[PDB]
Design a protein around this nucleic acid. Structure first.
Ligand SMILES: [Mn+2]
Length: 476
RNA sequence: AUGGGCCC
RNA sequence: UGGGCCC
């Protein structure tokens, strides 16, 4: 995005310099090159002379202004993708009711009861429970006012900033590159679900390479489905973006909402409007109130869906801008926000696409750092998606999501107080695909202290989930 | 100490 | 109601 104005308001909001992620017994054993993100401005382990909040908003390099030819090209790509998208999902995207928006629908889960309320509720100190009732499906008078304001399109708001308490690489922790969370108001999140919840739910259930979205997927079971698809193609690319969410230019965002969420496809008139308010935002960090143009605020409703849609359109846009006579069936892809895997039988040159992505404001680079110039001939077994490799299981002969051991060590090395036991059960479901020897080694430090599930138990669970009949066939 | 997904 | 992982 582009920072247009900065000013210090008289009021001030509390941040989060507590870092709840404490080390575990594993940390001393594995000695990982990872640690909690630097939340304090005077954090001792930061590099010399690094002002934290200075680095925080360094992602906002600018709002890439597109030309009329480029905007016209982008509009056609948005329309063509939208055509494909709604032909699979259908045209049933009617306005969702207040009950359905809160309680969810078949595909879309309910809203989080105990979570950050946003502005101007966090200042006065009113949580979601005060405004919206739990397990009820109704809204208070403060929210009701916002709904009617959003109908007339008079509603305005400001995004609340929060430092993301998470584990990051020590190089980025020392650099002071802590990621930020853009918390929108609860009424915005609610109304967004009313406008496009029917659409979002439908995408989750129909996730796959056809619509080009992995939002709604379960890696354990769906890795087989995706693996077999991408293995069929000759060339596969593990593309990585640089600040994908921040670098969404206004022209790209505005045109995408105008083509995808039209009244022709069943959406409400305000479905376009509510999404367009994400373009120009006002972010509140402590005392500084920063007005920003362009970029997606990470924390609005359907952020992963909007990013996924934009990601799909960018690939279509970039190819058509370089090559001639390119269509949707020319290539295949699936994405989850910024994360993407592209494939095609044609020998496409992604190195030549670099500047065509730069017109959108995006900077694509290869995930595989070796050479670092977008080579050809790669397969699904080389690439990564959702921090998971695609490896063939030696027993069942299906693809399984295998995370890197160094990543798994970093996860196990840190935890909140009291959550260690429950975390060890959850992470074991991820670690099972690494293999019996690697599974044992990852949970070796925790032996004789916490409950560690067996390899046999979690493997047999996965075999039932990935198919179910595969387990039954082995008996006969 | 968000948005959504998935597993508990 | 709470925990984890991914984006
Ligand atoms: Mn990737």
């Amino acid at each position: 995005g582009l920072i247009v104005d900065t000013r210090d308001v008289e009021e001030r909001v509390h941040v989060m310099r507590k870092t709840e992620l404490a080390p575990t017994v594993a940390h001393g054993v594995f000695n990982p090159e990872f640690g909690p993100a630097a939340l304090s401005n005077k954090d001792p382990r930061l590099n010399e002379g690094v002002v934290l909040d200075e680095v925080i908003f360094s992602k906002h390099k600018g709002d890439t202004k597109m030309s009329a030819e480029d905007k016209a090209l982008f509009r056609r790509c948005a329309a063509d993708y939208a055509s494909r998208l709604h032909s699979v999902l259908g045209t049933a995207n009617a306005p969702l009711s207040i009950y359905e928006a809160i309680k969810g629908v078949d595909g879309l889960d309910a809203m989080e009861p105990d979570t950050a309320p946003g502005l101007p509720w966090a200042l006065q100190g009113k949580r979601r429970g005060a405004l919206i009732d739990f397990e009820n499906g109704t809204v208070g008078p403060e929210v009701e006012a916002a709904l009617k304001l959003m109908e007339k399109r008079e509603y305005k708001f400001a995004c609340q900033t929060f430092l993301k308490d998470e584990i990051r690489p020590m190089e980025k922790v020392r650099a002071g590159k802590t990621r930020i969370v853009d918390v929108l108001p609860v009424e915005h999140i609610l109304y967004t679900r009313m406008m496009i919840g029917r659409f979002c739910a439908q995408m989750h259930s129909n996730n796959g390479p056809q619509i080009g979205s992995a939002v709604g997927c379960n890696p354990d079971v769906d890795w087989q489905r995706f693996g077999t698809h991408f293995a069929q193609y000759r060339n596969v690319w593990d593309v990585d973006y640089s600040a994908f969410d921040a670098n969404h230019c206004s022209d790209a965002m505005n045109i995408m909402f105008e083509e995808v969420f039209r009244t022709e496809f069943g959406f409400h008139p305000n479905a376009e409007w509510i999404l367009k308010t994400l373009v120009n935002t006002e972010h509140a960090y402590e005392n500084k109130r920063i007005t920003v143009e362009g970029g997606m605020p990470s924390g609005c409703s359907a952020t992963s869906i909007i990013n996924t849609i934009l990601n799909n359109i960018y690939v279509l846009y970039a190819l058509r801008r370089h090559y001639e006579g390119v269509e949707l069936d020319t290539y295949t892809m699936i994405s989850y926000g910024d994360d993407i895997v592209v494939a095609s039988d044609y020998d496409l040159d992604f190195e030549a696409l670099k500047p065509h992505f730069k017109s959108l404001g995006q900077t694509i680079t290869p995930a595989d750092k070796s050479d670092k110039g977008f080579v050809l001939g790669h397969s699904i077994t080389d690439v990564t998606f959702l921090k998971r490799h695609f490896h063939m299981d030696y027993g069942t002969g299906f693809y399984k999501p295998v995370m890197a051991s160094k990543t798994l060590e970093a996860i196990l090395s840190f935890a909140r107080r009291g959550t260690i036991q429950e975390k060890l059960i959850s992470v074991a479901g991820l670690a099972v695909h690494s293999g019996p020897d690697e599974y044992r080694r990852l949970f070796e430090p925790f032996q004789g202290l916490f409950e560690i599930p067996s390899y046999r138990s979690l493997y047999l669970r996965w075999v039932n989930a990935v198919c179910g009949d595969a387990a039954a066939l082995e008996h006969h």
